[PDB]
Scaffold this active site. Structure first.
Site, PDB file in Angstrom:
ATOM      1  N   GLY A 161     -10.254  19.643 -69.844  1.00 56.74           N
ATOM      2  CA  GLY A 161     -10.862  20.930 -69.579  1.00 56.74           C
ATOM      3  C   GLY A 161      -9.842  21.897 -69.020  1.00 56.74           C
ATOM      4  N   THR A 162      -9.187  22.648 -69.901  1.00 55.10           N
ATOM      5  CA  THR A 162      -8.097  23.536 -69.503  1.00 55.10           C
ATOM      6  C   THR A 162      -8.575  24.986 -69.538  1.00 55.10           C
ATOM      7  OG1 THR A 162      -6.571  21.930 -70.469  1.00 55.10           O
ATOM      8  CG2 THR A 162      -5.686  24.099 -69.883  1.00 55.10           C
ATOM      9  N   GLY A 163      -9.376  25.324 -68.543  1.00 56.06           N
ATOM     10  CA  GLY A 163      -9.753  26.696 -68.286  1.00 56.06           C
ATOM     11  C   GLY A 163      -8.778  27.320 -67.317  1.00 56.06           C
ATOM     12  N   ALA A 164      -9.277  28.265 -66.520  1.00 53.48           N
ATOM     13  CA  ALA A 164      -8.432  28.861 -65.492  1.00 53.48           C
ATOM     14  C   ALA A 164      -7.947  27.808 -64.503  1.00 53.48           C
ATOM     15  CB  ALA A 164      -9.193  29.970 -64.769  1.00 53.48           C
TER      16      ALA A 164
ATOM     17  N   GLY B 240      -7.950  24.239 -64.662  1.00 59.01           N
ATOM     18  CA  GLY B 240      -7.097  23.210 -65.235  1.00 59.01           C
ATOM     19  C   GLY B 240      -5.763  23.758 -65.703  1.00 59.01           C
TER      20      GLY B 240
ATOM     21  N   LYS C 247     -16.879  23.956 -48.951  1.00 56.91           N
ATOM     22  CA  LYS C 247     -16.701  24.910 -50.040  1.00 56.91           C
ATOM     23  C   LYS C 247     -18.025  25.530 -50.470  1.00 56.91           C
ATOM     24  CE  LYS C 247     -14.344  27.301 -52.850  1.00 56.91           C
ATOM     25  NZ  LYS C 247     -14.185  26.835 -54.264  1.00 56.91           N
TER      26      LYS C 247
ATOM     27  N   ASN D   8     -19.136  29.296 -52.010  1.00 56.97           N
ATOM     28  CA  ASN D   8     -19.612  29.478 -53.380  1.00 56.97           C
ATOM     29  C   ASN D   8     -21.089  29.864 -53.427  1.00 56.97           C
ATOM     30  OD1 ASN D   8     -17.360  26.969 -54.486  1.00 56.97           O
ATOM     31  ND2 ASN D   8     -17.330  29.101 -55.206  1.00 56.97           N
TER      32      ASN D   8
ATOM     33  N   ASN E 168     -20.885  33.347 -55.308  1.00 58.60           N
ATOM     34  CA  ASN E 168     -21.088  33.151 -56.741  1.00 58.60           C
ATOM     35  C   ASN E 168     -22.412  33.762 -57.195  1.00 58.60           C
ATOM     36  OD1 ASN E 168     -18.850  31.351 -56.134  1.00 58.60           O
ATOM     37  ND2 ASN E 168     -19.233  30.396 -58.130  1.00 58.60           N
TER      38      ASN E 168
HETATM   39  C1  LIG Z   1     -10.934  31.479 -52.052  1.00 61.03           C
HETATM   40  C2  LIG Z   1     -12.249  31.051 -52.705  1.00 61.03           C
HETATM   41  C3  LIG Z   1     -12.079  31.211 -54.206  1.00 61.03           C
HETATM   42  C4  LIG Z   1     -12.685  32.552 -54.559  1.00 61.03           C
HETATM   43  C5  LIG Z   1     -12.670  30.020 -54.979  1.00 61.03           C
HETATM   44  O1  LIG Z   1     -12.163  28.963 -54.808  1.00 61.03           O
HETATM   45  C6  LIG Z   1     -13.854  30.111 -55.952  1.00 61.03           C
HETATM   46  O2  LIG Z   1     -14.004  31.075 -56.754  1.00 61.03           O
HETATM   47  O3  LIG Z   1     -14.695  29.174 -55.976  1.00 61.03           O
END
Ligand SMILES: CC[C@H](C)C(=O)C(=O)O
Ligand SMILES: CC[C@H](C)C(=O)C(=O)O
Lengths: 310, 310
Positions: B8-11, B13, B192, B196, B200
């Site tokens: 999975g080579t997106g941003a 990877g 995290k 997110n 997000n």
């Molecule tokens: C610094 C947090 C960064 C925006 C990230 O890791 C994400 O988009 O989930």
């Protein structure tokens, strides 16, 4: 026969003013928007309840100073312009006139009372109605229409207040509308908040009308959770709502034709949203009573953010 | 020198695979999208931290069966495709290979473990990085990049697990990246989630990037309230987050360049959102622990509604 002034002739003022005029009342309309279109073409109503109705010619005015003194003043403007509305109401009011706020939200009459003579009776009218402006001078009435009236302030003792509320209810019932004399205006306003708080804001935030909002399990669940927050806040502030009121309101909206709440149209045309009366005031009343409404609080925050953007 | 497979080579990877390759590692990329553009032009990185970097030619593959056995497998796909990812991981894995999920959300490794041989080590890597795809084969790296690694499952006793996590952290530190060996993967994932979950979903719901969200008092207040819900849920499930973690995260995002979270890009291109890992799993864990997250619950409902529309 009463002389009725309509201060703010949008969808709401247009509808109830036209209905009263069609019942034989002497109705005078103050137009801030569409004055020349309405004084030209008149006022038209497409209604799935009452059929097509037209008022032509209409007793139309661009300025409250030109209006004759009215015994009842129906205020159909949004709550956003209520401060600027007070001089227009005072100008059009006959001595001892009754002012009826056909407006949603909470605390509306309390915020207008300091700007009205205490010789005027101030009443709220909670309209459960699906109506919006169509083409200029055309009112689109999709469903419902009933008005719950209640008394807020004025030079009337406690017997006279019940009498005046009944007089107002009879005006609408005489015009073919459902109308109920409420014992408690604030309780009545909390009742309508249970509908406007979820549906008005979610229609803007989710860019949707009532039917998709009710067809989707997740938005239906969110609406019910928000309803229970308002029911809880009302209970905390000392107002009992009817048993199972949320399912009662949810079922009426499933029956309801696909409908865009007024706030949806407001955001669509760049007009200021009625956040102060519908969200800020209930949130503050709930805070003062020690009751938190997390979803409503967050919905209010989201709507304020959306209003501040491009 | 390790043989690294990127599944999975997106941003994500693309970034970490290229950084490892530039440090001298033998990196093999599995391309599901942009295979011929990347095998043509290679892999390019515009980075405000590391400057411009290019990988050309790239060891590129369209099928996992063609990949050589790899000692480390970096999974940079979204969590939405993890079920379909397992056969690709098994195919590319050398015996006893380490699988590192560079993915957000909660419960990710637990849901993948049933599909991976128990002879494979399964690890999570929480990346704090502002990165997105630019033009095809071009990675746009705006800020940060550090990776917190933790061990989930595998044939390793308790000493060996610490050793393997350190081995992984050293891979990234050797490539010029910040990296921390975490004692507790689930605790790291809750950390995290505090970022997110608000950013997000609100970027999709409010159609905004980080800078307007932080400049507006109402969205800033809403973000902090959501953070405290996640912090509370984590505490209820038995995980302590650092003192004042919300202000700590809020300050890093004020420092952060204007950034569109991955979920914003997902909704903008009609791709399925990572709701299951980022919202559903924390909500279920919070429910099982008797802890309610009303704002996160409602945000999740709103995002599911938006996904179901036109
Ligand atoms: C610094 C947090 C960064 C925006 C990230 O890791 C994400 O988009 O989930
Ligand atoms: C029946 C409820 C109706 C939709 C209404 O009165 C409103 O828009 O506020």
């Amino acid at each position: 026969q009463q002389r009725i002034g309509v201060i703010g002739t949008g969808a709401i003022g247009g509808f109830y003013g036209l209905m009263l005029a069609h019942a034989g009342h002497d109705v005078h309309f103050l137009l801030r928007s569409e004055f020349e279109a309405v004084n030209r073409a008149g006022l038209s109503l497409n209604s799935a309840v009452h059929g097509f109705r037209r008022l032509a010619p209409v007793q139309a005015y661009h300025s409250a100073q030109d209006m004759p003194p009215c015994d009842w003043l129906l205020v159909g403007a949004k709550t956003t312009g209520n401060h600027e509305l007070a001089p227009l109401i005072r100008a059009a009011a006959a001595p001892g006139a009754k002012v009826l706020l056909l407006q949603n939200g909470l605390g509306v009459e309390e915020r207008l009372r300091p700007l009205l003579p205490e010789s005027l009776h101030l009443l709220g009218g909670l309209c459960f109605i699906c109506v919006h402006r169509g083409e200029p001078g055309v009112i689109e009435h999709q469903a419902y229409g009933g008005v719950n009236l209640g008394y807020h302030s004025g030079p009337a003792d406690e017997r006279r207040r019940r009498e005046i509320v009944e007089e107002g209810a009879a005006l609408f019932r005489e015009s073919g509308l459902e109308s109920t004399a409420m014992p408690d205006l604030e309780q009545a306003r909390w009742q309508k908040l249970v509908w406007n708080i979820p549906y008005n804001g979610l229609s803007v935030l989710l860019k949707s009308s009532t039917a998709p909002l009710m067809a989707n399990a997740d938005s239906r669940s969110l609406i019910e959770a928000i309803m229970e927050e308002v029911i809880g806040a009302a209970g905390a502030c000392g107002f009992i709502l009817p048993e199972g009121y949320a399912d009662q309101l949810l079922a009426a909206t499933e029956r309801m034709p696909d409908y865009r709440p007024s706030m949806y149209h407001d955001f669509a045309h760049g007009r200021p949203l009625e956040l102060a009366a519908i969200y800020a005031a209930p949130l503050a009343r709930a805070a003062a009573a020690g009751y938190r409404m997390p979803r409503v609080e967050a919905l209010h925050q989201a709507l304020r953010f959306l209003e501040a953007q491009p």
